[PDB]
Design an enzyme around this catalytic site. Sequence first.
Site, mmCIF file in Angstrom:
data_model
loop_
_atom_site.group_PDB
_atom_site.id
_atom_site.type_symbol
_atom_site.label_atom_id
_atom_site.label_comp_id
_atom_site.label_asym_id
_atom_site.label_seq_id
_atom_site.Cartn_x
_atom_site.Cartn_y
_atom_site.Cartn_z
ATOM 1 N N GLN A 10 29.323 -16.756 3.683
ATOM 2 C CA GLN A 10 28.368 -16.254 4.678
ATOM 3 C C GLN A 10 27.085 -17.081 4.574
ATOM 4 O O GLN A 10 26.314 -17.199 5.551
ATOM 5 C CB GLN A 10 28.135 -14.795 4.409
ATOM 6 C CG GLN A 10 27.712 -14.516 3.032
ATOM 7 C CD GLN A 10 27.784 -13.040 2.613
ATOM 8 O OE1 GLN A 10 28.732 -12.680 1.835
ATOM 9 N NE2 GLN A 10 26.868 -12.260 3.005
ATOM 10 N N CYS A 61 28.127 -10.256 5.287
ATOM 11 C CA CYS A 61 29.119 -9.424 4.479
ATOM 12 C C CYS A 61 30.158 -8.882 5.581
ATOM 13 O O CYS A 61 31.437 -8.901 5.659
ATOM 14 C CB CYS A 61 28.668 -8.757 3.216
ATOM 15 S SG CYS A 61 27.500 -7.411 3.391
ATOM 16 N N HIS A 80 27.244 -4.041 -0.328
ATOM 17 C CA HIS A 80 27.901 -5.315 0.004
ATOM 18 C C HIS A 80 29.331 -4.949 0.415
ATOM 19 O O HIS A 80 29.990 -4.108 -0.233
ATOM 20 C CB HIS A 80 27.847 -6.236 -1.216
ATOM 21 C CG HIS A 80 28.420 -7.614 -0.995
ATOM 22 N ND1 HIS A 80 28.182 -8.337 0.168
ATOM 23 C CD2 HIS A 80 29.234 -8.387 -1.762
ATOM 24 C CE1 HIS A 80 28.831 -9.483 0.090
ATOM 25 N NE2 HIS A 80 29.447 -9.541 -1.072
ATOM 26 N N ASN A 110 36.042 -12.007 -1.468
ATOM 27 C CA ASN A 110 34.574 -12.059 -1.373
ATOM 28 C C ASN A 110 34.112 -13.047 -0.300
ATOM 29 O O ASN A 110 34.764 -14.086 -0.060
ATOM 30 C CB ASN A 110 33.977 -12.462 -2.742
ATOM 31 C CG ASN A 110 32.499 -12.168 -2.803
ATOM 32 O OD1 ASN A 110 32.052 -11.169 -1.945
ATOM 33 N ND2 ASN A 110 31.692 -12.776 -3.493
#
Lengths: 4, 212
Positions: free
Chosen positions: B19, B25, B159, B175
Amino acid sequence: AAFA
Amino acid sequence: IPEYVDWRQKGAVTPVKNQGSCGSCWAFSAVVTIEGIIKIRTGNLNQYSEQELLDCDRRSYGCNGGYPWSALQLVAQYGIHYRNTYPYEGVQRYCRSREKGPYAAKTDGVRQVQPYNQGALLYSIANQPVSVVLQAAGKDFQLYRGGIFVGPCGNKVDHAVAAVGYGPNYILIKNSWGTGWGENGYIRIKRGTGNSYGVCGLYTSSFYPVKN
């Protein structure tokens, strides 16, 4: 609240 | 309900992404969610734009705050483009959706998994990946360069990421950071401990579109  | 669930070797998740210096996120987590389902029926794996989700979702606060559960809803309602006809840049801007032209992907609804229930998380993660949140503001989860995270960490969720598999004991998460984190952009957290909330609050609020 908003997730960053 | 296999003893092992990996969607990677299932041809459901694409390469990893970042990102960047963009608190986004939420849109990334989503693109993976919708994505998964989109490939689960049609048999066509795709990379959709998160950038679009940023510039379009005004309900979310783009480059710094959002709801993985607006994004999805959004798509289902409207749609979402490829990550080629709307590649990620990292900065929130004007919606290009319309200007971009015809949509490419569009779901048929969004549903949420009953918070605080691993048994429930898995099932859904078994039928298709899901968008999940947790505590990342972590100073440990931040340093994870491979392993099974147990902590320490907290219950202050903030998150959003994605679950793309689990084991008798470890839950797999994708992630939104570079492949220069955890185990190649991947991180294994531990399940079955009693922690209802779930370590790092990974059991707070999870989600997913629908597809016919």
